[PDB]
Design brief:
The chain has about 180 residues and is α/β, with parallel strands linked by helices. The protein is about 30% helix and about 30% strand. The chain is globular and about 40 Å long. Its EC number is 2.1.1.171. Keywords: Methyltransferase, rRNA processing, S-adenosyl-L-methionine, Transferase.
Length: about 180
């Protein structure tokens, strides 16, 4: 397996490993990305987070339960030079990590693409809102099963929503 960065400084690079909505997000971000802090909720390959890094996000934090995948991430972040002030890997499931009430918001951008069928993305959404994780106007990217679950937390606005195949892609904005 390998991840190829599409844009930014590292565009073209492929990283060893074990869509439209995406583009429009980065598009609306370009003006702010340089000072935006991100959360890649369920890292995995890290594709989303690395992409954000390539585009000079202020910071990306990767959450990953599987230690084997989490080490790979660290290896790639060492492969491509990133200070601990630019990228961070926390070996935890976001379902539990996000249960910790924050005194101050941490994220301008959030990527939530966990496995389907277990209302996991929904659980994460609830926690982000419940525990003061989101900074004002934060964008939340969510990928879910193609058919019928998602309701907009009320302090959020649904900006984009496309369904291709079996996946529903959504982009919300934290408007509080």
């Amino acid at each position: 397996g390998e991840v190829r960065i599409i844009a930014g400084l590292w565009r073209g690079r492929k990283l060893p490993v074990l869509d439209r909505v995406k583009e429009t997000l980065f598009n609306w971000l370009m003006p702010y990305i340089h000072q935006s802090e991100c959360l890649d909720g369920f890292a995995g390959s890290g594709s989303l987070g690395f992409e954000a890094l390539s585009r000079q996000a202020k910071k990306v934090t990767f959450l990953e339960l599987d230690k084997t995948v989490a080490n790979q991430l660290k290896k790639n972040l060492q492969t491509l030079k990133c200070s601990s002030e630019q990228a961070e890997v926390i070996n935890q499931s976001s379902l539990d990590f996000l249960k910790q009430p924050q005194n101050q918001p941490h994220f301008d951008v959030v990527f939530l693409d966990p496995p389907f069928h277990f209302n996991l993305a929904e659980q994460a959404i609830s926690l982000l809102c419940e525990n003061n994780w989101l900074k004002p106007n934060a964008l939340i990217y969510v990928e879910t099963e193609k058919d019928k679950p998602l309701i907009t937390p009320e302090n959020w606005t649904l900006l984009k929503e496309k369904t291709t195949g079996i996946v529903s892609y959504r982009l919300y904005q934290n408007l509080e």
